[PDB]
Design an enzyme around this catalytic site. Structure first.
Site, PDB file in Angstrom:
ATOM      1  N   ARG A   1       0.950  -1.116   0.010  1.00  0.00           N
ATOM      2  CA  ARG A   1       0.050  -0.068  -0.073  1.00  0.00           C
ATOM      3  C   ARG A   1       0.960   1.108   0.063  1.00  0.00           C
ATOM      4  NH1 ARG A   1      -3.417  -2.747  -1.491  1.00  0.00           N
ATOM      5  NH2 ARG A   1      -5.686  -3.138  -0.879  1.00  0.00           N
TER       6      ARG A   1
ATOM      7  N   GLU B   1      -2.877   7.380  -4.895  1.00  0.00           N
ATOM      8  CA  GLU B   1      -3.102   6.850  -6.106  1.00  0.00           C
ATOM      9  C   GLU B   1      -4.519   6.990  -6.659  1.00  0.00           C
ATOM     10  OE1 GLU B   1      -1.722   2.562  -5.157  1.00  0.00           O
ATOM     11  OE2 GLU B   1      -3.643   1.936  -6.261  1.00  0.00           O
TER      12      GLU B   1
ATOM     13  N   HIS C   1      -0.100   0.083 -10.275  1.00  0.00           N
ATOM     14  CA  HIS C   1      -0.618  -1.041  -9.459  1.00  0.00           C
ATOM     15  C   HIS C   1      -1.308  -2.089 -10.210  1.00  0.00           C
ATOM     16  CE1 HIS C   1      -3.000  -1.208  -5.249  1.00  0.00           C
ATOM     17  NE2 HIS C   1      -2.274  -2.467  -5.728  1.00  0.00           N
TER      18      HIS C   1
END
Length: 328
Positions: free
Chosen positions: A244, A273, A291
């Protein structure tokens, strides 16, 4: 009693057949999109009043906002299960769910291979500062300004949060000739260490050539790597994060890249993000992905199937397969 329903939040991409199959057990309902306001209106309207279980995902957060205390408080009293697609679930308030009598499952051990594959990809990218030669060859520059990289052979991989993902990263990294160290709040028993050497937090910062992290995000692990921790690392450390992004103080990470303290980073995740700190995005020595960790056919379908199997178990037997450790 009669009339049980299951509610799908968001999309199911690969396992639609398995979802439709549950219609032999329950009424299938869907909230494919609409926004938090409309989701809360539906809840208050009584239309979900027979819903015993909910399928949701990390991606589906865009349609409802997080399943925080406020949203859990609005769910109908019928809801007994929330089956979540994702190994991380920091967008569900687990204690609020427990208080409302709701059991939560996630998807642990389906994400491990893909995420580790991307972690090693990122690590080699960062050690070669590969964005430079990737860009140069396409520009017809051949090498361009490519600089010499470093081999992972003989170097120390440090893992903060050795779990299922970390063990798969370690397995790969050892084949690259790396030595493995790790820190968890508690030393793992020997089979779960799977060869890695336990060290203190400060020792992990001091000794890692490549520093990687796999922690759940919470109010205390937010910025667990900040200025103080970066300053403890080796000059020339390379940092990898597939977990994360908010585990790292990204603004502090940028300053540390700027001073030359951190040689490179290999990131798949970011603090805000899809935004990325500009000094990070604009650094051609960084290796950056948006990601994509679990974005494969086989991993995504395995994750969906695990959620749907949890749902089916909940409905048929009144138990989950992978209930979150907080409740277990």
């Amino acid at each position: 009693m009669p009339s049980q329903a299951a509610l799908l939040i968001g999309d199911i991409v690969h396992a639609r057949a398995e979802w439709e199959a549950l219609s032999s057990l329950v009424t299938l309902k869907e909230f494919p999109e609409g926004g938090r306001e409309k989701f809360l209106e539906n809840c208050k309207s009584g239309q979900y009043d027979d819903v015993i279980a909910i399928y949701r995902s990390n991606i589906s957060t865009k349609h409802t906002g997080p399943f925080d205390r406020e949203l859990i408080s609005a769910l109908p009293k019928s809801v007994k299960y929330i089956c979540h697609n994702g190994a991380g679930y920091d967008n569900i308030d687990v204690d609020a769910a427990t208080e409302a009598g709701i059991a939560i499952s996630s998807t642990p051990i389906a994400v491990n291979n893909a995420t580790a594959d991307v972690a090693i990809f990122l690590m080699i990218g960062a050690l070669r500062q590969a964005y430079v030669p990737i860009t140069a060859i396409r520009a017809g520059e051949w090498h361009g300004k490519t600089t010499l990289g470093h081999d992972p052979n003989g170097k120390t991989l440090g893992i903060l949060g050795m779990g299922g993902i970390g063990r798969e990263v370690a397995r790969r990294a050892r084949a690259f000739g790396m030595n493995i160290i790790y820190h968890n709040r508690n030393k793992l028993p020997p089979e779960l260490e799977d060869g890695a050497k336990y060290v203190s937090f400060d020792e992990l910062l001091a000794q890692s050539d490549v520093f990687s992290l796999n922690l759940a995000l919470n109010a205390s692990t937010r910025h667990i790597i900040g200025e103080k921790e970066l300053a403890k690392m080796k000059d020339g450390v390379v940092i990898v994060n597939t977990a994360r992004g908010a585990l790292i103080d990204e603004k502090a990470l940028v300053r540390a890249l700027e001073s030359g303290k951190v040689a490179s980073v290999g990131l798949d995740v970011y603090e805000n993000e899809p935004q990325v700190e500009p000094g990070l995005l604009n650094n051609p020595r960084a290796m950056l992905l948006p990601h994509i960790g679990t974005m494969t056919y086989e991993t995504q379908k395995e994750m969906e199937l695990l959620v749907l199997n949890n749902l089916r178990s909940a409905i048929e037997k009144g138990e989950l397969l992978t209930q979150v450790p907080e409740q277990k």
